[PDB]
Amino acid sequence: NQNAQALNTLVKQLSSNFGAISSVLNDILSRLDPPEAEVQIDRLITGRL
Amino acid sequence: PDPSKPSKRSFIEDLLFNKVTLADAGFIMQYGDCLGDMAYRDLICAQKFNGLTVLPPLLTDEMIAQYTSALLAGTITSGWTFGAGAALQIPFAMQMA
Amino acid sequence: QQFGRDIADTTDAVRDPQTLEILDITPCSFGGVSVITPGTNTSNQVAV
Amino acid sequence: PPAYTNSFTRGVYYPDKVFRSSVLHSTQDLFLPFFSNVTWFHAIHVSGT
Structure with a gap:
């Protein structure tokens, strides 16, 4: 049960915003320009790491 | 192990598996060969939507059961002699003595 | 119902706007490679 | 009186x-609380006294 709960929590954490405009990289790229989105992408990567 | 059953699984393991809440909607053919006493949906590929691969264990349950049966048979027949060297047959009634 | 979800928080069931049908979603491989190599002194053949 | x-x-609704x-599934949205107190109205045909 603990292993399953940890795996499930790790899976749902992928959808965490971490203070960004959106939790999906594709949405960020489409709505927002790449160069300014670099900070948001870096923050999301840091949170996931 | 029961010689008649195709799978060499002891009665205790069968009861342990049975004591968990299972489902009756359909046919009980295999219903979980590795799960820890439950019956679930499709294999890890069903749950792997982000590449969360689950590497199969090196040792299979059949091998673990064979090891347990061999150790139990050695204990009944060879007693503790096989663990300290070559197996030495001896009646069980004389082992408890 | 139009869209579907799953415990993985990823779309699983969808509805085709053209015709009323249900199409499931599942990945094929996602990729994973292992290499088996014996002792290089004897031979260098490898298995994928 | 009421x-x-x-x-x-x-x-309840989806x-x-x-x-x-x-x-x-948990959902935090404007829903109808269960077992709450609700005021019931009255309807009469004759009145004026």
Whole structure:
């Protein structure tokens, strides 16, 4: 049960915003320009790491 | 192990598996060969939507059961002699003595 | 119902706007490679 | 005066069109509280006294 709960929590954490405009990289790229989105992408990567 | 059953699984393991809440909607053919006493949906590929691969264990349950049966048979027949060297047959009634 | 979800928080069931049908979603491989190599002194053949 | 009465469990609706099965889902949205007190109105044909 603990292993399953940890795996499930790790899976749902992928959808965490971490203070960004959106939790999906594709949405960020489409709505927002790449160069300014670099900070948001870096923050999301840091949170996931 | 029961010689008649195709799978060499002891009665205790069968009861342990049975004591968990299972489902009756359909046919009980295999219903979980590795799960820890439950019956679930499709294999890890069903749950792997982000590449969360689950590497199969090196040792299979059949091998673990064979090891347990061999150790139990050695204990009944060879007693503790096989663990300290070559197996030495001896009646069980004389082992408890 | 139009869209579907799953415990993985990823779309699983969808509805085709053209015709009323249900199409499931599942990945094929996602990729994973292992290499088996014996002792290089004897031979260098490898298995994928 | 207003007549208060127990509010039955009726009044639930799907938050969205998402499909789920055999999974409990939490949702924080404007819903009807269960077993809440509700005021029931009255209807009469003769009045004026």
